[PDB]
Write an enzyme that holds these catalytic residues in place. Structure first.
Site, PDB file in Angstrom:
ATOM      1  N   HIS A 150       0.755  -1.277   0.000  1.00  6.45           N
ATOM      2  CA  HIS A 150       0.000   0.000   0.000  1.00  6.45           C
ATOM      3  C   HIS A 150       0.757   1.279   0.000  1.00  6.45           C
ATOM      4  CE1 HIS A 150      -3.469  -2.388   0.542  1.00  6.45           C
ATOM      5  NE2 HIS A 150      -2.966  -3.044   1.585  1.00  6.45           N
TER       6      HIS A 150
ATOM      7  N   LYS B 208      -5.000  -9.692  -7.700  1.00 10.16           N
ATOM      8  CA  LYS B 208      -5.644  -9.106  -6.470  1.00 10.16           C
ATOM      9  C   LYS B 208      -6.678  -8.082  -7.064  1.00 10.16           C
ATOM     10  CE  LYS B 208      -4.867  -6.404  -2.359  1.00 10.16           C
ATOM     11  NZ  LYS B 208      -3.933  -5.727  -1.441  1.00 10.16           N
TER      12      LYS B 208
ATOM     13  N   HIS C 195      -2.962  -3.495   7.944  1.00 11.55           N
ATOM     14  CA  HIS C 195      -4.033  -3.740   6.943  1.00 11.55           C
ATOM     15  C   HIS C 195      -4.622  -2.431   6.528  1.00 11.55           C
ATOM     16  CE1 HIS C 195      -7.927  -5.148   5.619  1.00 11.55           C
ATOM     17  NE2 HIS C 195      -8.514  -4.370   6.513  1.00 11.55           N
ATOM     18  N   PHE C 196      -4.877  -2.303   5.232  1.00 10.46           N
ATOM     19  CA  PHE C 196      -5.561  -1.142   4.689  1.00 10.46           C
ATOM     20  C   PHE C 196      -7.059  -1.481   4.683  1.00 10.46           C
ATOM     21  CE2 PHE C 196      -5.348   2.902   2.659  1.00 10.46           C
ATOM     22  CZ  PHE C 196      -6.597   2.944   2.030  1.00 10.46           C
ATOM     23  N   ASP C 197      -7.884  -0.816   5.489  1.00 15.23           N
ATOM     24  CA  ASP C 197      -9.313  -1.180   5.586  1.00 15.23           C
ATOM     25  C   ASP C 197     -10.172  -0.409   4.564  1.00 15.23           C
ATOM     26  OD1 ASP C 197     -10.877  -2.970   7.066  1.00 15.23           O
ATOM     27  OD2 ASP C 197     -12.021  -1.224   7.818  1.00 15.23           O
TER      28      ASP C 197
END
EC number: 4.6.1.18
Length: 124
Positions: free
Chosen positions: A12, A41, A119-121
């Protein structure tokens, strides 16, 4: 094996650019960050800011993540981001994406000590 913090940076972070410069940014980055190696992805977000600024989100506004975990944080400031989304034509191994620029708040989940993003939410 690769740590959750390191996977986050590889998936990210793009501190090297201020924004996506062409329609091919996503195609380029999904491949060079190895996100298309085993399968395409489906969606990915890149953050065009300093790593320290992103890490710092971990001590910003708490919010429950989409999946209900309580270790998510929303940035106080908007950030330059690029959203990547497969094209209708994307077909492994020829993964293909639509690149969209945006300036939004980011929501990340954090863990560890140092407490950093893993984590990228979402972008909001």
């Amino acid at each position: 094996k690769e740590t959750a913090a390191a996977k986050f940076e590889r998936q990210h972070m793009d501190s090297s650019t201020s924004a996506a410069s062409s329609s091919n940014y996503c195609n380029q980055m999904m491949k060079s960050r190895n996100l298309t190696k085993d399968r395409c992805k489906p969606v990915n977000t890149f953050v065009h800011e300093s790593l320290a600024d992103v890490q710092a989100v971990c001590s910003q506004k708490n919010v429950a993540c989409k999946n209900g975990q309580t270790n998510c944080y929303q940035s106080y400031s908007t950030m330059s981001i690029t959203d990547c989304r497969e094209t209708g034509s994307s077909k492994y191994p020829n993964c293909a994406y639509k690149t969209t620029q945006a300036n939004k708040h980011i929501i990340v989940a954090c863990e560890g000590n140092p407490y950093v993003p893993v984590h990228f939410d979402a972008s909001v």
